[PDB]
Amino acid sequence: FMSADGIVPGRTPVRYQGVEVGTVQDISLSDDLRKIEVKVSIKSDMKDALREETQFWLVTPKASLAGVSGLDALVGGNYIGMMPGKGKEQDHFVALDTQPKYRLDNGDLMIHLQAPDLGSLNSGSLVYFRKIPVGKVYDYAINPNKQGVVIDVLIERRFTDLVKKGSRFWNVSGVDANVSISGAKVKLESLAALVNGAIAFDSPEESKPAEAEDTFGLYEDLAHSQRGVIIKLELPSGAGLTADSTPLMYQGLEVGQLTKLDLNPGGKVTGEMTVDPSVVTLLRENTRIELRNPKLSLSDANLSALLTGKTFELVPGDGEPRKEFVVVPGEKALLHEPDVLTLTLTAPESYGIDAGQPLIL
Amino acid sequence: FMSADGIVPGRTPVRYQGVEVGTVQDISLSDDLRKIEVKVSIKSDMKDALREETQFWLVTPKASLAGVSGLDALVGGNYIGMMPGKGKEQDHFVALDTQPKYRLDNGDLMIHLQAPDLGSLNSGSLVYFRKIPVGKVYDYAINPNKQGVVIDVLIERRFTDLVKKGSRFWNVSGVDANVSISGAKVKLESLAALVNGAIAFDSPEESKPAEAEDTFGLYEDLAHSQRGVIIKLELPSGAGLTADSTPLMYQGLEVGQLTKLDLNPGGKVTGEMTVDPSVVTLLRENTRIELRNPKLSLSDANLSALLTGK
């Protein structure tokens, strides 16, 4: 032992699963080499499992955060816990530090999630389906690649059929912090989510069940877990475009959201947008996506339209479906219509004619 | 037992409803197969009910959240609780984990509610009438269809006549703070609702009493539980229309609220609006519903009308 804080040589039981098995006999020091040698007698019933892969630890109460451990050890004195294994033979053991998880093998389902960072999740945080606890987080570890973090979670046996291949997992925080334009709307749903942390998951309708350490991806939010279709956009510039803030308006209703915005070399601004499955059939050839500036109308004032800014507008077409588009400015919107009569006319003088003047018949 | 944490073979009583009945005699291990065999002696008075459908559990204190359980077990040592049933005969039992609810059958009324999700509600959250507690949530479960969640609640005997066929239920949990342009509304209930949650309900005037596990729908808010009449609208576009924010103004007073807004295929924008029962008789043939844009008047400036929109 590194430090035998409260081990009495006379009476200090060795408990396996709370059942007393042995008793501490003697305590000595290995000539002050920061090691405490404890000689403990073990009854003959347990000597069959007294093998090489056996773990020992010292259960001692402490004032931990978000709950106190070792209440039984506080009431009845700190003791020694043991866990047998499948070794060959051993008579000299090294005590552990924090009593590693041993599991129970009750038929539960063990699955893995991959996240860029652990987040607020700790050991013991809950897993929710329909806001009903159906499991808990078992362990966490770092991938051999330093980029990834693997969270190993366990779902109870009664809900093993709930997990499917298409099931999606996200992190839940019981805080809504909407701002909008009227004022700050703050709603507190679940306090346990703030205190502890929670992973919620959703089960699809028709999918095969998942089993045997199937891996999944942990989305950072419920909104990020929403299913959608990726569309690549070749934007002219990103002057008034904001990621996760610029919508795609069709018939006055928002159906898309600009998600990614990048600057490829050569000064090429490109974007990536998620569209909901309702308007996928409207994305075909000769289907145009354009940008509209917020115009100010004195007759019909729209403060919300002024506050939103640039808006993506969708003009459906017909043909083979496509997943990539080229965005043209609003000045050139008339030029890219399927039928349009383009004319070039010469004059010795400009006569004060700009590039936005109309033609009148 | 899966783990006998503090069972002393000498003195460890078996208590039914707090009454000592038996005493733990012996503890042994089933050749290290993660099972603890506990031999307990039971007095001859209880052997009549010692049958197959008998439940046993280990009452042990723990530092639970929003309250600590097993205070008596903490004071007087952890013990074993039992619950008899109506089995045939049994001499080998399997201990349970969390002492499932046994109920009391005092004449209380048991009813069911259906919700898309449990929400903030947990076991023990309170049920309110006129902000007076008249019951509590008993249990929750998942429907065989994965879409629905069934919450089983229990109303006390004294208020069994309060529940009617037309009674409406809604969920009040947490705290919602909404700041307006010139106002601030902090909607919250008692501290137990903030910590755990609550279900409040309203009884109509003339309705038959409800009984025998009658089902109900759990609305998400008091506003959503308000009675109204559904009107379908064939809108031209949804350019400046927001769900649950666009009113229906008659004589300058708000009488309706645009609730649902959808895009049917073919580019057809449709809507669904709730109207209060006062103006139902005004909804007849050749009755027109139109949309007005917020116009700016220099002589009579109306900032609120400008901020409302369509």
Q: SS3 letters for B283-297?
A: CCCCCCCCCCCCCCC
B299 forms bridges with which residues in the sheet? Answer: none
Cα distances from A77 to residues A8, A62, A88, in angstroms, run 10, 12, 32
Would you tell me which residues 210-239 of chain B have a C-beta closer than 8 angstroms to some C-beta of chain A?
237-239
B210, B229, B13, B226: which is closest to B113 by C-alpha?
A: B210
- Tell me B154's DSSP state: E
Residue B9 near residue B25, CB atoms below 8 Å? yes
Which residues, 6+ apart, have CB-to-CB distance to B217 below 8 Å? B113, B114, B115, B169
User: Which residue from A124, A200, A131, A211 is spatially nearest to A163, judged by alpha carbons?
Assistant: A211
Contact A151, A218 (CB under 8 A): yes
C-alpha distances (whole Å) from A222 to each of A162, A185, A199, A229 are: 19, 19, 10, 16
A18 CB near a chain B CB, below 8 Å?
Answer: yes
d(CA A83, CA A61): 19
Chain B: residue whose CA lies nearest to A131: B118
Q: Which are the contacts of B14, defined by CB distance < 8 A and separation ≥ 6?
A: B20, B21, B22, B23, B24, B40, B42, B79, B80, B81, B82
Closest approach of B14 to chain A, Cα-based (Å) = 18
Q: Are B150 and B112 in contact (CB under 8 A)?
A: yes
- Alpha-carbon distance B52 to A158, whole Å? 23
Residue A15, burial from CB neighbour count under 10 angstroms (0-12, 13-18, 19+)? buried
Q: How far apart are CA A241 and CA A235, in angstroms?
A: 10
The reply to whether residue B29 touches residue A49, judged by beta carbons under 8 angstroms, is no
How far is residue B87's CA from residue B35's CA, in Å, rounded to a whole number? 24
> In chain B, positions 65-104, which contact chain A (CB-CB < 8 Å)?
65
End-to-end C-alpha distance for chain B, whole angstroms: 67
The pair of structure tokens assigned to B163 is 């529940």
3-state secondary structure of A309: coil
User: Measured between alpha carbons, how far is A93 from A56 in angstroms, rounded to an integer?
Assistant: 8
Q: Give just the sign of the alpha carbon dihedral A114, A118, A124, A128.
A: negative
The closest of B250, B159, B142, B275 to B209, measured between CA atoms, is B159
Nearest Cα neighbor of B108 from B47, B43, B155, B173 is B155
Q: Do the Cβ atoms of A155 and A161 come closer than 8 Å?
A: no
Is residue B307 exposed (0-12), middle (13-18) or buried (19+ Cβ within 10 Å)? Answer: middle
Provide the token pair at A353: 């004619």
CB atoms A298 and B296 under 8 Å: yes
Torsion angle defined by CA atoms of residues A161, A162, A164 and A167, in that order, rounded to the nearest 10 degrees: -170
Helix H or strand E encompassing B306:
helix B303-308
Tell me the CA distances in angstroms from B12 to A217, B43, B165, one per residue in order.
49, 14, 50
Give the whole-angstrom CA distance, residue B278 versus residue A78: 72
What's the half-sphere exposure (Cβ side, CA atoms, 13 Å) at B3? 10
Residue spans of beta strands (DSSP E) within B149-210:
149-155, 168-172, 176-179, 184-187, 198-202
B34 and A CB contact within 8 Å = yes
Least Cα distance to A271 among A256, A285, A282, A281 occurs for A256
Partners of residue A255 in chain B, C-beta under 8 Å: 263
The beta-carbon contacts of A193-197 under 8 Å, at least 24 apart in sequence, are A195/A66, A195/B65, A196/A66, A196/A122, A196/A124, A196/A125, A196/A126, A197/A119, A197/A120, A197/A121, A197/A122, A197/A125, A197/A171, A197/A173
What the block records as the tokens of A305 is 């339209």
Neighbour count for residue B51 (Cβ, 10 Å)? 14
Burial state string for A288-297 with b = 16 or more CB within 10 A and e = fewer than 16: bbbbbeeeee
Residues recorded for chain B: 310
DSSP character at residue B210? P
Distance between CA A59 and CA A5 in Å, rounded? 10
Closest CA to A237 of A255, A275, A264: A264
Question: Which residues does a gap of C–N over 2.5 Å follow in chain B?
Answer: none
- Whether B209 and B219 have beta carbons less than 8 Å apart is answered as no
Give the one of B120, B149, B179 whose C-beta lies nearest to A132's C-beta: B149
Q: Tokens at residue B158, please? A: 């004294």
C-alpha B200/C-alpha A124 separation (Å) is 32
Written as six digits, the tokens of A302 are: 């729209």
d(C-alpha B218, C-alpha A81), whole Å: 48
Measured between alpha carbons, how far is A69 from A59 in angstroms, rounded to an integer?
9
B7, B120, B269: residue with CB nearest A252: B269
CA distance A48 to A44: 8
Contact in structure between B20 and B61 (CB atoms under 8 Å): no
CA distances from B167 to A359, B111, B217 (A): 66, 12, 10
The beta-strand segments (E) located in A67-208 are 79-83, 109-115, 126-129, 132-142, 149-155, 168-172, 175-178, 185-188, 198-202
Helix-strand-coil split of chain B, %, nearest 5: 10, 40, 55
Other CB atoms within 10 Å distance of the CB of residue A168: 19
Test A49 with B34 for CB contact under 8 angstroms.
no
Q: Which of B114, B269, B137 is nearest to A130 (CA)?
A: B114
Chain A 187-206, residues with CB within 8 Å of chain B CB atoms: 187-192, 195, 203, 205
Interchain contact, B240 vs A191, CB within 8 Å: no
Q: Which of A130, A23, A70, A86 is nearest to B119 (CA)?
A: A130
- The number of residues making up chain A comes to 361
Nearest to A9 by CA among A33, A39, A43, A32: A39
Contacts of A67 in chain B (CB under 8 A): 63
Residue with tokens 């860029």: A116
Q: Which residues contact A352 (CB under 8 A, 6 or more apart)?
A: none
Q: DSSP secondary-structure letter at A193?
A: H
CA–CA distance, A149 with A323 (Å, rounded to integer):
32
Do B284 and B292 meet the contact criterion of CB atoms below 8 Å apart? no
